[PDB]
Design a protein around this nucleic acid. Structure first.
Ligand SMILES: Nc1ccn([C@H]2C[C@H](O)[C@@H](COP(=O)(O)OP(=O)(O)OP(=O)(O)O)O2)c(=O)n1
Ligand SMILES: OC[C@H]1O[C@@](CO)(O[C@H]2O[C@H](CO)[C@@H](O)[C@H](O)[C@H]2O)[C@@H](O)[C@@H]1O
Length: 580
DNA sequence: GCGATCACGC
DNA sequence: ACGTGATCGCA
């Protein structure tokens, strides 16, 4: 049964009521400088569809959009806000975002359209976007009557569902998490994405050219050492060269054949000179394909900026993710890849990049949640936590901790945060399951509060059905009750890890909100460009560095109050590389 | 188009 | 743990 609405030819006052469900539809997945294909408004006066060329040229409509006192309920308001920013139009007054609400209620539903959210509350009078638009090469905006009905049904769904979603959030003690954390964050992310990050494309191109030359040289050395040309990027053609023509040992298998992962190759290197060259080839090829070529493909040729999209409603722990480009995995560990960061530069003359990162926030969060006396004391002393962990688990003085001991203790600390298992620690350290289990036992002997936490959190997940973070983010773990050991064990590790990873996410999100407020209060021109889980990257005039050196770490350190201090390191420089 | 594999970040 | 995405190769 069709849904009634006015297919409007002009904007009227009744469309500009002080509460409405608003749809500002951007069908392109990447909404940067993208078309708005249609607008729907549902409010106390009825249901309306507006052509965007009409609405967005209308001064009254534009003023309504930008009026903070005119409240709008939406789904994925960031998409609309950014698309409107590209058109020089400010969207304000978004009081409810159904995407974020659905995400907080259950991130596992993978809600990514209104229909999916609606189905959570048995509301089915709206089509999935994929049904309307199609996907891939077949994707298209449909004719107006079909488009208009869809946008109106989405607006109608939002109008109906706001209350039951808010009611459930309130029951879960998550309504503040939506209204005071995620919704304000969405506006901040919209700003960051719209600002973009300036790229030194000539530098990337120069690196591209040098990598191409190095790739050619290593490629040829590989064919030489193999006495044969083949496709090095096929883990199957490669597996044949290595494990058949050259007869190398099969140390590890995949599901469909031989492993050629770097950890395996590193083990095979002593047998044949080809292996180190395959590794080198892989390193260079990663830089060339993913970073150089990948960045260059998405840089805007006019402004030479990249404009990531931070997916705020994807990860199961409350982290953001970043796409097109992913600016959360730019290399740093290896110097060769780290130089990619030299191409990320400030957007204005005489500005600098300022980067601030939490030091060991996940382990500090663990100390807090677990109330582990030893771990808390370690952070209260600002100890090197890996050296301290080695001291405790290997029962030596600080002076007796060797580099290998620190390395193994560090791995244990990661294992503990990730949700410890002897098999997984064993794989990481290239040791036996029994040896890994002894390490873990020693760790829990030294950190008995952490042990009690890991036990208790798994029991709580079983009892309640979910675990929660500091600011009341939730993750359901139905597999915690599985009688399949492997399935259950993965859920147990999620129980252990999610409050840690997710509370750290909560903290940095709050820090972003607090920081933006302080930046505005101080009228600094500095602004956020990126978040990389435990770090914030800003740019600012060079004249603001001294103020940022004090302000940014303070705001980040004070975002929450834990049983241990939070510590933030910071650096600045003329490129992201130099902000070290 | 999509799954397997691999490698980059935290 | 939690992510994105490149290439291959088989649809
Ligand atoms: N109705 C509520 C109550 C709490 N919280 C979240 C956000 C708060 O910052 C955090 C802490 O709650 P309390 O301060 O009440 O403890 O939990 C929430 O989202 N909604
Ligand atoms: O706008 C981001 C928001 O949209 C969703 C779908 O609702 O993801 C879409 O947009 C992403 C960014 O372009 C794409 O990566 C994704 O493939 C696309 O579905 C949400 O997941 C996201 O929060």
């Amino acid at each position: 049964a069709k849904m009634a609405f006015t297919l409007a030819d002009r904007v009227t006052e009744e469309m500009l009521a002080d509460k409405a469900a608003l749809v500002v539809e951007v069908v392109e997945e990447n909404y940067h400088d993208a078309p708005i294909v249609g607008i729907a408004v549902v409010n106390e006066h009825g249901r309306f569809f507006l052509r965007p060329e009409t609405a967005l040229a209308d001064p009254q409509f534009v003023a309504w959009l930008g009026d903070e006192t005119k409240k709008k309920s939406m789904f994925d308001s960031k998409r609309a806000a950014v698309a409107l920013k590209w058109k020089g139009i400010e969207l304000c007054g978004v009081s409810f975002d159904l995407l974020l609400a659905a995400y907080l209620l259950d991130p596992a539903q993978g809600v990514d359209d209104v229909a999916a959210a609606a189905k959570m509350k048995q509301y089915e009078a709206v089509r999935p976007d994929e049904a309307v638009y199609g996907k891939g090469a077949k994707r298209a905006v449909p004719d107006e009557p079909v488009l208009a009905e869809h946008l109106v049904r989405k607006a109608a769904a939002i109008w109906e569902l706001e209350r039951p979603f808010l009611d459930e959030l309130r029951r879960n003690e998550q309504d503040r998490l939506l209204v005071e954390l995620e919704q304000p964050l969405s506006s901040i992310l919209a700003e960051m994405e719209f600002a973009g990050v300036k790229v030194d494309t000539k530098r990337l191109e120069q690196m591209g050219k040098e990598l191409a030359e190095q790739l050619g040289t290593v490629e040829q050395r590989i064919y030489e050492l193999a006495g044969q040309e083949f496709n090095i990027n096929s883990p199957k053609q490669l597996g044949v060269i290595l494990f058949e023509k050259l007869q190398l040992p099969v140390l590890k298998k995949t599901k469909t054949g031989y492993s050629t992962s770097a950890d395996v190759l590193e083990k095979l290197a002593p047998y044949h000179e080809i292996v180190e060259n395959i590794l080198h080839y892989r390193q260079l090829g990663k830089l060339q394909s993913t970073y150089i070529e990948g960045l260059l493909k998405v840089v805007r040729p006019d402004t030479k900026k990249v404009h990531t999209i931070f997916n705020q409603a994807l990860t199961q722990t409350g982290r953001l993710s970043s796409t097109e480009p992913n600016l959360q995995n730019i290399p740093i560990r290896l110097e060769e890849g780290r130089k990619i960061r030299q191409a990320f530069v400030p957007s204005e003359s005489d500005w600098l990049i300022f980067a601030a990162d939490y030091s060991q926030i996940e382990l500090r969060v663990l100390a807090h949640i677990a109330e582990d006396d030893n771990l808390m004391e370690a952070f209260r002393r600002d100890l090197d936590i890996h050296t301290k962990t080695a001291m405790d688990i290997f029962q030596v003085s600080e002076d007796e901790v060797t580099p290998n001991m620190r390395r193994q203790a560090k791995a244990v600390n990661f294992g503990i945060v990730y949700g410890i298992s002897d098999y997984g620690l064993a794989q990481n350290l290239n040791i036996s399951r029994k040896e890994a289990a002894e390490f873990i036992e020693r760790y829990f002997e030294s950190f008995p509060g952490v042990k009690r936490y890991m036990e208790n959190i798994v029991q709580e997940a079983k009892q309640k059905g979910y675990v929660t973070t500091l600011l009341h983010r939730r993750r359901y773990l139905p597999d915690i009750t599985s009688r399949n050991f492997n399935v259950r064990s993965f859920a147990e590790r999620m129980a252990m890890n999610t409050p840690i990873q997710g509370s750290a996410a909560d903290i940095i999100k709050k820090a972003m909100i607090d920081l933006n407020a302080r930046l505005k209060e101080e009228r600094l021109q500095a602004h956020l460009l990126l978040q990389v889980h435990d770090e914030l990257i800003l740019e600012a005039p060079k004249e603001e560095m001294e103020r940022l050196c004090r302000l940014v770490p303070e705001v980040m350190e004070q975002a929450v109050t834990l049983r241990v201090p939070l510590k933030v390191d910071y650096h600045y420089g003329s490129t992201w590389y130099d902000a070290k």
